[PDB]
Write an enzyme that holds these catalytic residues in place. Structure first.
Site, short mmCIF file in Angstrom:
data_model
loop_
_atom_site.label_atom_id
_atom_site.label_comp_id
_atom_site.label_asym_id
_atom_site.label_seq_id
_atom_site.Cartn_x
_atom_site.Cartn_y
_atom_site.Cartn_z
N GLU B 27 3.10 -10.24 4.88
CA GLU B 27 1.76 -10.52 3.99
C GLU B 27 1.00 -9.14 4.02
O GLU B 27 0.58 -8.56 2.93
CB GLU B 27 1.07 -11.69 4.22
CG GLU B 27 0.05 -11.84 3.24
CD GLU B 27 0.42 -11.75 1.92
OE1 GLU B 27 1.45 -12.26 1.41
OE2 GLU B 27 -0.22 -11.09 1.01
N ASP B 58 -1.80 2.32 6.71
CA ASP B 58 -1.38 3.07 5.71
C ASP B 58 -2.26 4.22 5.59
O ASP B 58 -3.41 4.30 5.78
CB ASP B 58 -1.16 2.43 4.40
CG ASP B 58 -2.62 1.99 3.83
OD1 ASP B 58 -3.18 0.98 4.08
OD2 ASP B 58 -3.15 2.81 2.77
N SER B 88 -5.94 -12.97 2.92
CA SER B 88 -7.24 -13.93 3.56
C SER B 88 -6.66 -15.38 4.21
O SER B 88 -7.56 -15.60 5.01
CB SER B 88 -7.83 -14.41 2.22
OG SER B 88 -7.20 -15.12 1.25
C1 LIG Z 1 -5.26 -6.63 3.24
C2 LIG Z 1 -5.04 -5.36 2.56
O1 LIG Z 1 -5.64 -5.04 1.36
C3 LIG Z 1 -4.41 -4.20 3.37
C4 LIG Z 1 -4.36 -3.03 2.76
C5 LIG Z 1 -3.62 -1.82 3.52
C6 LIG Z 1 -3.41 -2.15 4.86
O2 LIG Z 1 -2.73 -1.08 5.41
C7 LIG Z 1 -3.45 -3.23 5.38
O3 LIG Z 1 -2.95 -3.82 6.75
C8 LIG Z 1 -3.95 -4.35 4.75
#
Ligand SMILES: CC(=O)c1ccc(O)c(O)c1
Ligand SMILES: CC(=O)c1ccc(O)c(O)c1
Ligand SMILES: Nc1nc2ccccc2[nH]1
Lengths: 185, 188
Positions: B27, B58, B88
């Site tokens: 997720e 990222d 969430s």
């Molecule tokens: C939850 C979320 O939006 C999110 C966005 C980029 C990420 O690298 C991550 O680990 C979570």
């Protein structure tokens, strides 16, 4: 309940100096007094247990058990989980909470952990008695430094309440050292 | 989040056999891939830490940090606390979650426990880089029996994902034994 969990101090009071910790008991006692008022015998029993939990019993009618038409859960669960600051605050800040309701010939039980019901309110047996009981274990994640219930802080407030609520008997019991009192005007 | 806490199995899947546990990682990975796709370099790094937490990072734009007009908290907090299944759910079922957002030259940090933020999102410093990082500790109150991340389950899935997401570098690292993989398909 996440609004309460985010800022416990704003709802219950200071969580470090022991003010919030004792207010947890007083919030539950307010609900027990209202229930005791509308019953016949009109007695409340506040018990400090050896494992650092507090239970508040009344001998009133028992809080309503039927399904709430809007929320779709037991009326008791709505009281314990939906936002006097409310016992839902106490439930949110308790690592465990045991609810026992004696009403309409039946004993009902439900367990919460950090305000989350572990199962639906359930009929566990039969009984002639009536009343409600809440036993709660304060969350040691929230309540710091002063984590143990001082007897005299509770005794002081329950004495004040006994004068104001003249028709109600209020018993205080400490199972740690066997201390006890009986406030009645 | 109490709806998720009431019945975790309905949102994340089976919390006993390990499938729900690994769905927590996937997720978060799906959200990281979405963020990575918005950039040009597009790299994701999934790290299994020695304390059985998993971090996913990222190098994309960074999720929004400004205060949401209605909710009155950072847009990041809204994403983490308001109900794929959504992050969430992962936040709700994690005993700890660490969020780090690099955006507009600023490092933003926030810590959650069981879905509850410990403080508001805070600018703690400065940075030349951009991106989002989520590190989570699965709740041992929810996840029973299988509580450890199997490298092979993650490696297999990330390999499959690499072929669907062209230009996205996906790195897997295991700090328990030092095992690592690099899946980068550049097709089209
Ligand atoms: C939850 C979320 O939006 C999110 C966005 C980029 C990420 O690298 C991550 O680990 C979570
Ligand atoms: C929660 C609630 O309504 C309540 C009512 C009576 C009680 O004796 C009690 O301990 C709690
Ligand atoms: N230990 C712990 N703390 C919690 C707070 C909210 C919901 C569940 C939780 N379990």
């Amino acid at each position: 309940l996440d609004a309460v969990r985010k800022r416990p101090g704003m709802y219950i009071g200071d969580t470090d100096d022991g003010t919030g910790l004792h207010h947890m008991v007083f919030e539950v006692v307010d609900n027990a007094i209202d229930e005791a008022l509308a019953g016949h015998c009109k007695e409340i029993i506040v018990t400090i247990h050896a494992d650092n939990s507090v239970s508040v019993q009344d001998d009133g009618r028992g809080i309503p058990t039927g399904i709430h038409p809007e929320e779709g859960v037991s009326a008791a669960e709505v009281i314990m989980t939906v936002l006097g600051v409310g016992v839902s605050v106490v439930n949110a800040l308790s690592q465990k909470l045991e609810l026992v309701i004696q009403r309409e010939g039946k004993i009902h039980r439900q367990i919460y952990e950090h305000g989350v019901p572990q199962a639906p309110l359930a009929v566990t047996g039969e009984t002639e008695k009536t009343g409600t009981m809440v036993r709660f274990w304060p969350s040691l994640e929230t309540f710091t430094n002063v984590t143990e219930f001082e007897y005299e802080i509770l005794a002081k407030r329950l004495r004040e309440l006994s004068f104001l609520n003249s028709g109600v008997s209020i018993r205080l019991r400490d199972k740690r050292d066997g201390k006890e009192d009986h406030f009645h005007y």
